[PDB]
Design an enzyme around this catalytic site. Sequence first.
Site, PDB file in Angstrom:
ATOM      1  N   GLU A   1       0.817  -1.201   0.000  1.00 56.77           N
ATOM      2  CA  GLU A   1       0.000   0.000   0.000  1.00 56.77           C
ATOM      3  C   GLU A   1       0.856   1.258   0.000  1.00 56.77           C
ATOM      4  O   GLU A   1       2.091   1.243   0.058  1.00 56.77           O
ATOM      5  CB  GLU A   1      -0.923   0.029   1.238  1.00 56.77           C
ATOM      6  CG  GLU A   1      -0.212  -0.420   2.545  1.00 56.77           C
ATOM      7  CD  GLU A   1       1.023   0.397   2.847  1.00 56.77           C
ATOM      8  OE1 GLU A   1       1.004   1.584   3.094  1.00 56.77           O
ATOM      9  OE2 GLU A   1       2.120  -0.303   2.788  1.00 56.77           O
TER      10      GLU A   1
ATOM     11  N   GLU B   1       4.607  -0.436   1.345  1.00 55.25           N
ATOM     12  CA  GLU B   1       4.632  -0.491  -0.133  1.00 55.25           C
ATOM     13  C   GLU B   1       4.686  -1.926  -0.683  1.00 55.25           C
ATOM     14  O   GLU B   1       4.656  -2.166  -1.895  1.00 55.25           O
ATOM     15  CB  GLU B   1       5.846   0.268  -0.746  1.00 55.25           C
ATOM     16  CG  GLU B   1       6.150   1.665  -0.167  1.00 55.25           C
ATOM     17  CD  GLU B   1       7.275   2.323  -0.927  1.00 55.25           C
ATOM     18  OE1 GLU B   1       7.946   1.734  -1.750  1.00 55.25           O
ATOM     19  OE2 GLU B   1       7.448   3.587  -0.632  1.00 55.25           O
TER      20      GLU B   1
HETATM   21  C1  LIG Z   1       8.031   9.348   1.464  1.00 54.07           C
HETATM   22  C2  LIG Z   1       7.216   8.187   2.028  1.00 54.07           C
HETATM   23  C3  LIG Z   1       6.482   8.340   3.235  1.00 54.07           C
HETATM   24  C4  LIG Z   1       5.737   7.284   3.747  1.00 54.07           C
HETATM   25  C5  LIG Z   1       5.739   6.057   3.058  1.00 54.07           C
HETATM   26  C6  LIG Z   1       6.457   5.920   1.871  1.00 54.07           C
HETATM   27  C7  LIG Z   1       7.209   6.973   1.354  1.00 54.07           C
HETATM   28  N1  LIG Z   1       6.279   4.625   1.422  1.00 54.07           N
HETATM   29  C8  LIG Z   1       5.499   4.029   2.331  1.00 54.07           C
HETATM   30  N2  LIG Z   1       5.157   4.816   3.382  1.00 54.07           N
HETATM   31  C9  LIG Z   1       4.371   4.458   4.592  1.00 54.07           C
HETATM   32  O1  LIG Z   1       4.030   5.570   5.401  1.00 54.07           O
HETATM   33  C10 LIG Z   1       2.577   5.754   5.444  1.00 54.07           C
HETATM   34  C11 LIG Z   1       2.004   5.240   6.751  1.00 54.07           C
HETATM   35  O2  LIG Z   1       2.608   5.946   7.846  1.00 54.07           O
HETATM   36  P1  LIG Z   1       1.829   7.141   8.595  1.00 54.07           P
HETATM   37  O3  LIG Z   1       0.534   6.513   8.993  1.00 54.07           O
HETATM   38  O4  LIG Z   1       2.753   7.675   9.645  1.00 54.07           O
HETATM   39  O5  LIG Z   1       1.624   8.058   7.441  1.00 54.07           O
HETATM   40  C12 LIG Z   1       2.063   5.039   4.218  1.00 54.07           C
HETATM   41  O6  LIG Z   1       2.233   5.807   3.022  1.00 54.07           O
HETATM   42  C13 LIG Z   1       3.019   3.834   4.265  1.00 54.07           C
HETATM   43  O7  LIG Z   1       3.044   3.248   2.948  1.00 54.07           O
HETATM   44  O1  LIG Z   2       4.999  -2.183   8.606  1.00 51.30           O
HETATM   45  C1  LIG Z   2       4.709  -1.423   7.635  1.00 51.30           C
HETATM   46  O2  LIG Z   2       4.389  -1.923   6.506  1.00 51.30           O
HETATM   47  C2  LIG Z   2       4.739   0.091   7.841  1.00 51.30           C
HETATM   48  C3  LIG Z   2       5.083   0.602   9.139  1.00 51.30           C
HETATM   49  C4  LIG Z   2       5.078   2.003   9.214  1.00 51.30           C
HETATM   50  C5  LIG Z   2       4.796   2.895   8.210  1.00 51.30           C
HETATM   51  N1  LIG Z   2       4.461   2.283   6.997  1.00 51.30           N
HETATM   52  C6  LIG Z   2       4.415   0.934   6.783  1.00 51.30           C
END
Ligand SMILES: Cc1ccc2c(c1)ncn2[C@H]1O[C@H](COP(=O)(O)O)[C@@H](O)[C@H]1O
Ligand SMILES: O=C(O)c1cccnc1
EC number: 2.4.2.21
Lengths: 346, 346
Positions: free
Chosen positions: A171, A314
């Site tokens: 995701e 991701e």
């Molecule tokens: C630059 C960047 C930032 C976040 C990212 C990312 C790239 N790739 C995945 N995440 C991760 O961070 C997010 C969830 O964390 P929170 O709930 O704190 O936002 C989602 O986008 C998750 O895929």
């Molecule tokens: O465990 C994950 O996939 C994760 C944890 C923090 C922020 N985004 C993704």
Amino acid sequence: LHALLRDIPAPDAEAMARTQQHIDGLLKPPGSLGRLETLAVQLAGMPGLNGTPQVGEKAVLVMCADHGVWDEGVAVSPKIVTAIQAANMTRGTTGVCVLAAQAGAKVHVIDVGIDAEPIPGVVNMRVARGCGNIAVGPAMSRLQAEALLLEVSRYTCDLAQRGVTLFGVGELGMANTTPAAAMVSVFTGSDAKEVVGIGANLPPSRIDNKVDVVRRAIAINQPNPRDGIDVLSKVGGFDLVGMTGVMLGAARCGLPVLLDGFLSYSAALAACQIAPAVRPYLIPSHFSAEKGARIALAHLSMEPYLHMAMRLGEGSGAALAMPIVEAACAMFHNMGELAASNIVLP
Amino acid sequence: LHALLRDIPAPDAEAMARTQQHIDGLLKPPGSLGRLETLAVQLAGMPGLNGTPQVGEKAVLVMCADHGVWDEGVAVSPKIVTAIQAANMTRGTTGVCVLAAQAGAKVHVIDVGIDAEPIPGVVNMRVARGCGNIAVGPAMSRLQAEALLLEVSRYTCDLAQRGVTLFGVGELGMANTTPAAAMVSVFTGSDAKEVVGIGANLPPSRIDNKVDVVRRAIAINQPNPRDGIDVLSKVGGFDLVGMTGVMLGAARCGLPVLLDGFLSYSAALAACQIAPAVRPYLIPSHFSAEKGARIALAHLSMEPYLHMAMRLGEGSGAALAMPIVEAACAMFHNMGELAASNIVLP
Ligand SMILES: Cc1ccc2c(c1)ncn2[C@H]1O[C@H](COP(=O)(O)O)[C@@H](O)[C@H]1O
Ligand SMILES: O=C(O)c1cccnc1
Ligand SMILES: Cc1ccc2c(c1)ncn2[C@H]1O[C@H](COP(=O)(O)O)[C@@H](O)[C@H]1O
Ligand SMILES: O=C(O)c1cccnc1
């Protein structure tokens, strides 16, 4: 959908028995390859695999969407990052992209609800421009959740028609660890404090707030833990729903799905709630560094293979584990046999 | 040898600092890739790597030898299995062989003391036809241990000249978990009962005997824990010595070495005792299912990446982890940068 669920195949015990016997006869002390043996047996039981541990094409499906809860101050990444990163997914410069290429897997970027203009190259399945803010109401309607499950489910199985035998889920969605914690809390009956983490570098100070939001989301929506669709719709998100849908689709297709991290565990809990028959098709990848990871995994009764303290999401952990799956197949098919060397063990 | 030891290079802090900064700038929340980031930084500090995380050719060196202690009833595999399996190594039908091919690594089978006729295709470095029975005396002479360390050390570094940048260590030798437990006990100061395992399916009943043998070996030889060469020679084996030698050679060459399982931990303890400068070059692979694994790893201060309940040896776990190392390089070199997307995080 009820059909879909109804038709998920049970694992093939016959194939599994044959696999076990074959593994036991390999050039090694019996059981010596541990979890690699167990994994091989698991694969053999999956109907879409043709009675043997095998891996053809590999795909990682990344579900992108925005969340209204971002407005509650639960995420430090700017909202637009979802849209930006999604585009990057199309350029192969992201973490999953790099890892997937390493594993020889193809990345599928699916937009299930990004709050921005459509991105060319991204598969369009947008429900809406971001989901509702779970802190004050539901993320979406039940209908909306169901339809998406359906759509994603189908896309997934359709890929199978094209040679894909192994899926990975992922995701993208700033603030997504919030609805994820909410779901975990609900499904496992754990208190919010226990399962709320720092997500993408949320400052330790800002945690309390995040914990409050989760509690509020629950109080306000009153999601029914015995009803996975209810939970997803109320305190979930489009991305989370999409992930659950990949799981349902692969299972219906009789194929294996590699989980990712924390977000994926949430979706897995929902899918197993919705259809227990899904369980046997799931394969853990890594042990997420998110605080609520342990609780979530316990409830899924899963022990990941990789301990990398990863917390990117991701589908990066899923890609990382693909070679392990291929290794179990290689073991199965390429090792020699004890008998042939005249080796006799007790 | 003292030379050899003297010349092991220290890690390049300058390269490591540059690597860290580069990693921090990648398209992801800082530190989000956890141990993959740490690993990348570790590689960058290794002089033979040319200031960057990179992997060229890969090799797994398997040290084969027989042990006199087999006669004490500590192993259920027939003695001849060492010779047989070694030959199989030449046919690529073994567990390491299959896994190495999967990782694109080449397997090097080295005979350091098999009690049988020489095997064609196997590299010959035989010390003797099996080592002495540690239960009643030393496995070999100090001279013998030193010479072998030297020889293996050199072979290892020579491979580096030919393009090899990543090594993996392994062994083959019925009854070898016995001298391994002995070494572990000595180096860590743990009681034999705590570190003696079932090895290759030793029956639970036969354990007590194995524990007695270990105690006896120690009592009789009085190995000096502060002297790794002393320990190896007294209660070790040719195979164990060979493994330590790969470690010393790779370190001298400024290159990384992937550990395997329990047997490898033993050798690692010895190498670190002999030369602490070796430590920074070692990389854990998996968490062996051998009882004394936890104690051994704690003393090495290592946390393996893979939890597969594996207990085959041969360097199988090492091969299995190679893709992880390559993944860290891929991350380092192929991901995009935050700045370039105009992404600004706190
Ligand atoms: C630059 C960047 C930032 C976040 C990212 C990312 C790239 N790739 C995945 N995440 C991760 O961070 C997010 C969830 O964390 P929170 O709930 O704190 O936002 C989602 O986008 C998750 O895929
Ligand atoms: O465990 C994950 O996939 C994760 C944890 C923090 C922020 N985004 C993704
Ligand atoms: C057929 C066979 C048997 C054993 C094997 C093997 C193949 N490959 C590795 N081992 C493992 O088992 C041995 C150590 O266990 P113990 O001390 O109980 O003998 C070594 O050969 C080790 O490599
Ligand atoms: O951990 C290992 O490498 C191992 C454990 C038992 C028997 N042979 C090897």
